[PDB]
Design a protein around this nucleic acid. Sequence first.
RNA 1: UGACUGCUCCCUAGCAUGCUACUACCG
RNA 2: GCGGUAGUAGCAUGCUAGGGAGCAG
Lengths: 72, 590, 186, 187, 530
Amino acid sequence: KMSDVKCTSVVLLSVLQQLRVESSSKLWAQCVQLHNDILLAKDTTEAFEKMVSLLSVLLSMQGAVDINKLCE
Amino acid sequence: AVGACVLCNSQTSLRCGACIRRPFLCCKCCYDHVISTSHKLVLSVNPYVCNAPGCDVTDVTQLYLGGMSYYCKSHKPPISFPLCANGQVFGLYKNTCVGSDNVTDFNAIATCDWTNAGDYILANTCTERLKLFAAETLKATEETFKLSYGIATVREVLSDRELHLSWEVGKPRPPLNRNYVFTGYRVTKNSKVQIGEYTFEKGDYGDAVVYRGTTTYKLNVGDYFVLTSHTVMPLSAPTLVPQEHYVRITGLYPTLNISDEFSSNVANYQKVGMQKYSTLQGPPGTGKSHFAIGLALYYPSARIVYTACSHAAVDALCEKALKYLPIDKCSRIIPARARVECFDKFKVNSTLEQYVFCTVNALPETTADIVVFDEISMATNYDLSVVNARLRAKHYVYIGDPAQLPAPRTLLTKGTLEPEYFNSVCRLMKTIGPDMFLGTCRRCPAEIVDTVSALVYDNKLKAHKDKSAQCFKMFYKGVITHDVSSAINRPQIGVVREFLTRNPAWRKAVFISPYNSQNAVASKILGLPTQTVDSSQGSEYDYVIFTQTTETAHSCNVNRFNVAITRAKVGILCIMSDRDLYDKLQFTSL
Amino acid sequence: FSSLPSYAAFATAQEAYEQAVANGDSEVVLKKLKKSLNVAKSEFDRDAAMQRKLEKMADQAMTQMYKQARSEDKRAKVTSAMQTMLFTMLRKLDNDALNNIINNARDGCVPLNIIPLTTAAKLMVVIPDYNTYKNTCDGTTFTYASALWEIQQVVDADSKIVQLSEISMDNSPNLAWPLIVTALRA
Amino acid sequence: FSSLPSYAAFATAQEAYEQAVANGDSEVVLKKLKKSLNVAKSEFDRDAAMQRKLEKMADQAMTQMYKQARSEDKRAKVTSAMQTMLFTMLRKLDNDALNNIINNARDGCVPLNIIPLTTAAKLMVVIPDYNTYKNTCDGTTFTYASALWEIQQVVDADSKIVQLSEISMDNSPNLAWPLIVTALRAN
Amino acid sequence: ALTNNVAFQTVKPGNFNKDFYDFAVSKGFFKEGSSVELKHFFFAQDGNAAISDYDYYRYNLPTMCDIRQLLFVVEVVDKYFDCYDGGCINANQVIVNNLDKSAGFPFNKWGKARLYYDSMSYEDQDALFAYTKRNVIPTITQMNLKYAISAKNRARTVAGVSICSTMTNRQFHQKLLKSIAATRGATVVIGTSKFYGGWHNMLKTVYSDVENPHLMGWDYPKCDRAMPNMLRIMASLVLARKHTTCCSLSHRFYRLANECAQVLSEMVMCGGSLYVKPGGTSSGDATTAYANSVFNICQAVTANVNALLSTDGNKIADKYVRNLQHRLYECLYRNRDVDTDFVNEFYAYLRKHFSMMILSDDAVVCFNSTYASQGLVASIKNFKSVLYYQNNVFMSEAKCWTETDLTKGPHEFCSQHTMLVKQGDDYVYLPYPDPSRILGAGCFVDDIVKTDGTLMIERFVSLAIDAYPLTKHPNQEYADVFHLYLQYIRKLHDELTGHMLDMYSVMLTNDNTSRYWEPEFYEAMYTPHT
RNA sequence: UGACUGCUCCCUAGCAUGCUACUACCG
RNA sequence: GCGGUAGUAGCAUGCUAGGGAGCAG
Ligand SMILES: [Zn+2]
Ligand SMILES: [Zn+2]
Ligand SMILES: [Zn+2]
């Protein structure tokens, strides 16, 4: 299970990278921290914590038109 | 990259670099091209050339597979192997690609140059993929043409707004309006940085050129600009979409029992939901844009857009919306740099309107509901594809009457175009007819429709007005100084200036004549409302001071005269040009 | 490569020599035809060898080319590939906290800064209409990211601290609906 | 490999061979024929032999020679760029103050670590924290290395100009933190 | 400084390789509670990575190392290197590999080493060399951030050196560096494949009849920052010792000086600015892995010397060894000059009771047990003591394994565990790797180097050839990981020819490959022959 | 923006040898 | 009837250089 969590996180930070988020600094800091952490996790819970506490970072952006991708 | 054979559809991996478009050609079709015309340059995941250091070859014929590179004949290492081979050319899809036999028109477009009415009629009667291709290589010819021109430098800067300029050795000076924009450099041998956008116009007297610059660079004597230009892009949308039926109009909610000025329309209106897209053939200004108003509101609240080809056209159309439609649900969009100043009575450029209004020149590529296009008979099939792409909706209304003039096609010079061959939906209406019809006006006199009925239209065109006898002629001539691709009148317009005292109802006419700088000087003449013949069209205003100046075909066209006369709510001034035509219209002169 | 001229001559000479050594004849004609057969062979085989050689060179360059082309173009569509991969992966992972925020974000509400975790650390929500307000905001309490925030402000578009049930769905058109709410964790 | 004299000889040996073979005569005719053809074969072998070697070796020579040429040419380019960078570095340093400091030498030798310190002008400073800020570059100026310095601009991590005002104790936790102070050789 | 604004670094994530992972779970992997589970990853690093790392040199101190016992164990270490040869060479004898790497700074504004190794005659290079035998050439250096799989989220740096250093140190050392690299069966084992049963041979060497044998390794806590200077000079001196003819004197002395200015303590263009490097080595010059090995041996000896003397006097039983120790002290302090008889004597004593195999900073020692308990061979606690008083760091004892049985081999050397298994008829040592490494190297990459294996494969080959030994393992999921990599490579290849038969029907006309998706091609690897 | 080494696999090009048959040559 | 030589094509061995990738420090 959780193994997919680590994976999804790798994909995800790669996305936030290529969306040119590193023009900020403090962003790149908080993100790279969340990454470097779950990639040492131990229990699905606090993982999912840091997971959403990241993801929302992306959500606050407006490069993604998720109303599309949620086409299923 | 990869794709499909732009002609033979075969998925491929070639691009006939000799072309200007370099499209995707199957192996077989590429073979046929490189054997047929002059185009002898073939590109794949590298170019195919004589990878010898010194040797340079265009065709791939004497090109031989050498080791892993390519060579001309002279470097063919004995482990060689020709590329051009037995009715194919090595590439990819070796065995998949299926050739096709429109080698004919393929060569015909790849070789020609739009010089020909034939070139057009084929381009507008070839295959769809070739249709768009013809379209883009048309625009490409246009851009190369615009590129061929010259440069403008300064003799001296007369004012911060008025400048004294010249060009280089001979290079052709274009006409004058705002459609000519430049960008200069104060080159201290280096320091050759963009100094901003500058458009240029005729000075008030003699050698003067009024420049509006976007930047604040004070020009001096060692200064120059370049005529700046865009770069056309490829497209992919079909010029037409599939017309299909349904069962009725489903998923929407119309305007139940609308009104009477829209009474002669709801039948037509409901026909909207029956045909996948709809159209309207009607006489010039015939409840037409009015009909479109009553239809778009015939579904009261929907993602609607009013849009057309030109400026003043969509301008008067959106004033029409205004005049009927509630302005509160309406927003007129205009361009960015927007050196044109127009009817802007709504929330301007406010994107998220429900009834959005904008010209094609940058129609923001969005989805919508039933959008209408207006003056289909003006633009090119390229444009129709472009708008088909940018837009997504439910029903697509394309209104026009090819008796209304179309594009400039200032490349089309010898051998004009013929009606349906203007674009695709012109073919539609000239063949499959419109999709709806109403056939009489509220908008122009009776003697004037007698004029227009023996010329362009048939006598079968019969409007609804009267003869008010606010229509008079003359035939007098005098000065024609002319400038650059837009010649003017001085004594005819000066007789008009004293004639501004003659009959009262003529202190609010519109100065119209088949020239641009003519009507531009007309502002210097008496400060008379004006319009170049094209800047009218479809509309209807009361009075038009037509001063048909020169007597070239562009100056005495029957259709340019007709679109000058199809806009008079009440009457026309027209101090005529061709005594034959000068008597074709039936008034008193002085 | 059984379809070449040398193949034909090879076949004919073979036919003749087989006929002879089948008909029985002189040791001498044997040497004639046997030389002839040697000739036809030891050239036909050479042409066929070099032919299959060139054949293989062609196939190798072709397959290298395919490799390269598909490679590069994939390098060109990296972006859209990434995103679609991500979202399929997410709804694959399936979590109603994740689903919670995601659906909601497609709905209209999106936070305006990293959603924090501690009891403190307020967050800012942007709710775009009354109904969107009515589904989460029920009293001063607040479910979002399956977490319980209590409210501590409200404000419409032009930054007017507008009170709580001051607005009401009836009087809601009284309000700019880009509500910029704030709250704090349980 | 046809414009070979051996080609003339082998070609005529054939010519005669098919002449006396179409007119097929005696074992001696066959003998002359086969003999001529064997030996003109022999002429063809070496010509069509060594010539291959000559050709391939010519080609490899042309290759290596191109290569040598390109090598030296890029050497020229590098020497150029090198000296020009050198001189654009040079003409920004010959301040009198240096020439002073070197005359004052005991011998004309000074350790390097005190040249940019004393003679140079524009000062950059990195700062990680607010505390170190207010302890080391507080105010609008300061001395350091025993000389005065004036603040110009205080840019931050994203190179956003930041006035000397915003840096409160408590506007700090809203800043990218390693601010760069660009002070100047005050005098 | 140099610019007018410093530069900030960042180290992007790795990128996923979904499919292979989807395969992996489809074969019933990562099912919870597995004993194989991802553990190595591409960690990401924020802004101030470099300088926030290069800071670590503050772990490096000055030091004075006792002078007498140093002036002796340099001689013993020297004796360990009497079976090679080296000296100055000439341009047409250096040998460069991948002559295309970086070229430090500023030469990297103009291209790789192609140019500078190209835009110079041989006489150019010889003027250079036989020039620096009388002058000094201070240089710069760059710091680089590595970007590759890991297991600890720290940073990494590698000091890219400027060309005018390598371009001489090569010429000056190459002969030796080879002579070491290519000799089979000795102490230093740089350059001996672990394929074709060369590994097994390494071990059956470093055993070699020491009576009561235990195995012990160790590891150096922050090895290349904290190494004091004196020991670095000692390494450079022991290497140059064999130069007694090509060189002279002042030639050497300036050559040593040029090296100590170019790798020991010269400026460090870290980031966009210049600092100083107070000491410590620098893992990027021309003579590392060798110098690290030498230093390492110096530590092992010094530990044994202390372990000897430190022992009491009147409990030693073997009157011979007591007379050793006594003679040792005498030669060490009282004496002034070498006792070649004694030094040879000692070296032999060590080879008899403390044999050792060394890679660059990575050891294994096989030693005579009951001696250890009697303290006449430096068991671990002496390593604690030495790393302390002259590497002034603290080598925890949570990192130095120790082994009493010798069959199932050591514990971990060069990051392989060692199984002893039956091949053909006899018994051999195969080294196999931490499985999580193999997997978590399968699924995460740079981009095209995976993202889409169908172009690649060759990787998957090499990986499988590397995780073959795992077929012998008594655990399960281990051996699976092999059979995965196999059936994978197979299916992958199948779809490749499928496409090249499907889009472009160009069916590829023959096989041969099938040796790949069948194990026999591999196992032939671990087996003595060619 | 990418350091110094060392071991391996795959794919070319050259070379030498070495093997084998054919054909021609002289004993 | 047998040797040597000369070419050819085939097969091996090795060495060269040329790229593609993997691992350990
Ligand atoms: Zn072409
Ligand atoms: Zn084709
Ligand atoms: Zn050539």
